[PDB]
Amino acid sequence: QDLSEALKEATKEVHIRAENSEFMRNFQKGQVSREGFKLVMASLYHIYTALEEEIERNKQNPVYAPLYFPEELHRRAALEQDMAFWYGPHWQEAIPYTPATQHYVKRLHEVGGTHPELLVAHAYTRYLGDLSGGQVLKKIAQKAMALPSSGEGLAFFTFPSIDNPTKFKQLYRARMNTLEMTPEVKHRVTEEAKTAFLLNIELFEELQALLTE
Numbered sequence: 001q002d003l004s005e006a007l008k009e010a011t012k013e014v015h016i017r018a019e020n021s022e023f024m025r026n027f028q029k030g031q032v033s034r035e036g037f038k039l040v041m042a043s044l045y046h047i048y049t050a051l052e053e054e055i056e057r058n059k060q061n062p063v064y065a066p067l068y069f070p071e072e073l074h075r076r077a078a079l080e081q082d083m084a085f086w087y088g089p090h091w092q093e094a095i096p097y098t099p100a101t102q103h104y105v106k107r108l109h110e111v112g113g114t115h116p117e118l119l120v121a122h123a124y125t126r127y128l129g130d131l132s133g134g135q136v137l138k139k140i141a142q143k144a145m146a147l148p149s150s151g152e153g154l155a156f157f158t159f160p161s162i163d164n165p166t167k168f169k170q171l172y173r174a175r176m177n178t179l180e181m182t183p184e185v186k187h188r189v190t191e192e193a194k195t196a197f198l199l200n201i202e203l204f205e206e207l208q209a210l211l212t213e
């Protein structure tokens with residue numbers, strides 16, 4: 001069975017759980033505040049920073065290399081612009097770095113540094129979501145918070161080098177399917193994808209509590 005299918009199957013249950021975290025439930029209903037939106041976007045800034053550091057570290061490693069698409073996919077630059085938008089020109093000392101964010105970053109560095117054959121799980125969990133359901137979330141954010149169609153403050157959700165997210169997702173899946181796969185790697189990759197999802201749920205749990213304190 002192809003890796004792209006194996007990952008979709010292995011994470012469909014946990015995905016349902018992630019959508020129904022209290023934070024995402026509120027987000028999807030259009031009940032996201034600037035305060036809540038800033039917290040989550042600052043946490044993604046740290047997460048994607050770590051993810052992409054490790055991608056760059058492993059760009060030539062054949063257990064990752066076919067998924068090397070910085071121009072199309074990388075989010076760090078977009079997130080910097082968003083941080084300048086939401087937090088102002090001194091954003092680097094204004095943005096929070098929460099413990100649940102630190103925990104996700106830590107696992108990203110473990111994977112990138114010690115288990116790079118699992119990095120695909122982490123890329124899959126973030127980028128394929130961003131190209132799919134992230135575009136729905138963009139539209140809700142825009143409407144909730146009166147964010148302009150010109151895209152300021154939502155650079156994260158914008159892929160100016162990808163014409164068509166569906167076709168690119170199909171390419172990315174096809175290329176995932178060219179990674180050298182053994183039963184051992186496949187099984188652990190799908191497990192790590194479930195972990196990546198849990199790390200995201202734990203962040204959403206944490207942020208909700210911080211908003212409700």
Ligand code: HEM
Nearest residue numbers: 007008018019024025028124125126128129132133197200
């Ligand atoms: C309310 C929150 C969310 C909504 C409404 C949402 C919605 C979606 C939608 C509509 C799709 C496309 C499904 C399909 O094409 O069959 C999707 C795919 C995806 N979503 Fe999300 N999602 C949300 C949260 C998340 C979170 C928190 C993660 C990961 C952290 C994520 C990861 C993904 C991934 C990896 C895919 C690709 C599945 C695949 O094709 O293999 N989603 N999601």
